């Protein structure tokens, strides 16, 4: 009963995990898992709200780690080059983490159908071998079919779409971080809010958001 | 695209499928073994 | 055959995965551009060349040409109009590549969930498998899912992707023609030499 | 590579393969018909 | 033969391939492709050596190839070299684009023929299993499905892709013939000797795909 | 069972030897073994040793070779050339080993299917018992299974592991080259530590932080 | 009947492969590609150690290899380095293009062979499934299908694709050979130290596939 379900999930998920652990390390797999969880349960801050907070701060002179780091390095580091270097490094690092989480889940989605095909080969082998015990072809055919189905479902409805959501979230985080870096530069040189808003207004429809308009 | 050997794999699977169609072409129905298969499949598939 | 649950499985799931891939506003954007590339024929490049010659002789049917004329009326310099036209062309190319990505993505996901749906139907049949005479037709309905994906993969979504690629190529070509005509008009040069220059590009 | 319908075709072919081994697992074959099938195949292959 | 022919299968394959091709090509471009395919498959392309022979024969004097007829007609007309060159280059580019488009149409046909072969065999397996009361009689029913698959395979591998490849070969031969005709017509217009052009004209006779031959 | 893996690996080796000689094939197996039974050295210990040598003025073989080369007396560009050549040689060996196991992965399923087709020929040519037709097929089909396993679960995983080990050695050796250059030029330890800390947080390592 | 089956399967596979390749490639191209495959399988490329030895021998001197003969003739003929370099680079490019095109012919064979094997199995299975009424039909039909598929697999994997691979390996070997020849002739024309050029040519020995240390 439970043996065929656990065997199918074992072949598929265990094969995927073995191949990916030969590809990535356990700590890096855990890091990618954390990134996916953060991208799937927190909504990326809207850029328009980011511009609103940027102009509010400019006129004055929370709830966002990056700009809080910018204003903390602003009160201390008076030069703009140290802040620019740190901010670009953080943006590049986050881009790297998202790209590599994408890589981990694309690897999972690439390998899982291969494990489904190996599973149906194993089921064919077992039930072509027995062919005489009814209690022996049932589990075998179930293993074949369910390994194929789990490969298909995990590949096309979990791992590939998690990778695509991570790519989308990487683009959104890149945009938000670039806008916050621009705002920190604007508060560095004390630019007027109107000109910086006009300089940022070309970002509300940039790339994907160009289809809606 | 796809593995270059996938063509030969569909070849092999189609050859085997048609071989089994031929083996069915002179096969005969059995009721007791049918019921045994159905019951074991029901037990494996969690029903 | 026809079957409501099977087409529902394919279409709903394809939309579901593509929605995790694309926002739903982008879904409308791609569908609308596909409709416009199917039902509204893009004007012949020769007709646009004829309109360019007529305008040069005097001193409009396309939005691009009309906006170029409006930009040249108030005497915008060469650099600003060149930048605006290049941005518009890259914007159109981006929109077309996004629509092609949407329909290509539908192409990859439709048969994947055809296989998902037929496997689900087959495990359901084997888990409720009682009558011999019905093992045949039941799996038949299961194949109905696969077939639909196949059709949608090969007769609807992939051809629309290729049609959008073709339309995009022609649109960038005609809009390059339009920027060249705009430059010639703001130059005020004679029609003959500018027509030769544009004919050199074809 | 190969076109994706090749993968769809291989998946469908293997799925029918599983289906037909399931069907045969509960079907009994003829004896003389199978012996003559085997003889024809043996003649054909050498 | 009767067991290898069915009208529903051929109708499915050809209708669907034509539909998918017409969503990416027009009826005019498809007709142009068919005409170029017939012209390439019925009228052979002249060996270049015969072109040099005719060129040197008519150079000192200063007809089967229509491009050379156009060239000599423009030469007799008295047009300046710039316009003659422009018109001839336009003709070569038009022929090259037409040949590439014919290759594209037949490649699209060869790409979408086996896809619709799989669609047709899906339809056939649907019918076979929907009328499956006993696996005793499934031979011919499965056979027609395999038959649609085979029609797709044959049309893709032996008709449309060979026609596309033959059109690529014919376009390479056309480029060679057209450019040799260009050089010869230019030499005739200048009025030079027949021997002098034969020194540089044979240097690039085996260009590209002919480089393996030597 | 045994004859099936024998056929798959024999056909794979036979076809692959037309691309890689027995010398190169054994070199690839030696590289794979050395990467599998040994552990790569963590860059933190390398950074510690570099900063220790920099403040002062080793088991690691590249470290010993570089330190000896720099204490022998040689221009900066000469040590740069030697270190770059060694790093590139190791990179080339690892890429070629990845290539050998990738080629084995590409060829294994095709040879599994060839073995299966040969088995089916040998079975249909000696059809005697219907009840034994099944397992006979199962044996022939068995070959195909091994191809799949050897394609996805042996040869391709070793190709991935060699790629990973290659990145690890390239990163370690780049840290070594930078540290040796800093040792020669007498740089301040803080800037070199900053560079090493920056380098340790790029690439596939970035997910761990 | 068995000999008829073998002839028909060989005919389907090999004749179809030949016909489809002949549309793509000129008959002269096919003949030359066969000649190059034979030459690669029949002659062992001269080891780069021997060429380095010969190069240093005429390096400290101030003959078998044909390209060595051409380079020596050009160096004696008093032709400047640009003309000699360009001409022999043209010759190297010609041999590279030849080997690439022969690889293409055998790749085309290895692509079309399983396609024709599938055409053969479709034909054989259609014939068998139409003719369940007799053995005399299904025997040869199944034999045709299986043997045409097996021949497709074997010719594609163990003949045509590995011949393409051997041709590409020989192309790399001959490119290394003639690049060594170029370096040696140029070093002779400069007249540099035999030891320095010896070491610098030995430097090329660690290129591509020969990392076996
Ligand atoms: N078995 C064949 N194999 C190939 O078609 C193939 N193989 C290779 Cl290796 C390639 N490069 N291109 C290919 N088209 N599949 C198939 C053909 C026609 C119909 C149905 C199935
Ligand atoms: Na399956
Ligand atoms: Na089933």
UniProtKB/Swiss-Prot annotation, chain F:
Matching InterPro entries: Flag_MotA_CS (IPR000540), MotA-like (IPR047055), MotA_ExbB_proton_chnl (IPR002898)
Segments passing through the bilayer: 1-18, 104-124, 138-158
Subcellular location: Cell inner membrane
Major subcellular location class: membrane
GO process annotations (BP): bacterial-type flagellum-dependent swarming motility; chemotaxis; proton transmembrane transport
PROSITE patterns xrefs: MOTA
Signal peptide: none
GO cellular component: plasma membrane
Keywords in alphabetical order: Cell inner membrane, Cell membrane, Chemotaxis, Flagellar rotation, Hydrogen ion transport, Ion transport, Membrane, Transmembrane, Transmembrane helix, Transport
Pfam families: MotA_ExbB
Cytoplasmic side: 159-209
Recorded topology in the membrane: Multi-pass membrane protein
Presence of keyword Transmembrane helix: yes
Function: PomA and PomB comprise the stator element of the flagellar motor complex. Required for rotation of the flagellar motor. Probable transmembrane proton channel.
Listed PANTHER family: CHEMOTAXIS PROTEIN MOTA (PTHR30433), MOTILITY PROTEIN A (PTHR30433:SF2)
Family: Belongs to the MotA family.
Subunit structure: Each stator complex is composed of 4 PomA and 2 PomB subunits. 2 A subunits and 1 B subunit are thought to form a single ion channel, so that each stator complex contains two channels.
Name of the featured protein: Chemotaxis protein PomA
Species of origin: Vibrio alginolyticus
Lineage: Bacteria, Pseudomonadati, Pseudomonadota, Gammaproteobacteria, Vibrionales
């Amino acid at each position: 009963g439970m043996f065929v379900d656990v065997t199918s999930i074992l072949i598929v998920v265990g094969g995927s995990i073995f191949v990916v652990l030969m590809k990535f390390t356990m700590g890096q797999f855990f890091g990618a898992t954390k990134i996916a969880g953060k991208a799937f349960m927190f909504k990326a801050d809207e850029p328009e709200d980011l511009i609103a907070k940027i102009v509010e701060m400019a006129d004055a002179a929370i709830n966002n780690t990056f700009m809080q780091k910018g204003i903390d390095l602003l009160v201390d580091g008076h030069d703009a080059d140290v802040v620019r270097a740190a901010l670009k490094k953080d943006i590049a690092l986050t881009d790297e983490r998202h790209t590599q989480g994408t890589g981990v889940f694309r690897a999972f989605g690439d390998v899982a159908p291969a494990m489904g095909m190996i599973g149906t080969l194993v089921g064919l082998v077992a039930m072509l071998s027995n062919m005489d015990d009814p209690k022996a072809i049932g589990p075998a055919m179930a293993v074949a079919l369910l390994t194929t189905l789990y490969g298909a479902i995990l590949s096309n409805m979990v791992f590939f779409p998690i990778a695509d959501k991570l790519s989308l979230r990487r683009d959104q985080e890149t945009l938000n971080r670039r806008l916050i870096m621009d705002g920190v530069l604007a508060i560095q040189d004390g630019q007027n809010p109107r000109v910086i808003d006009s300089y940022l207004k070309n970002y509300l429809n940039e790339g994907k958001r160009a289809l809606e308009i | 695209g796809l593995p270059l050997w996938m063509g030969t794999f569909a070849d092999l699977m189609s050859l085997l499928m048609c071989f089994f169609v031929l083996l069915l072409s002179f096969s005969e129905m059995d009721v007791l073994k049918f019921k045994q298969i159905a019951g074991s499949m029901k037990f494996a598939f969690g029903v």
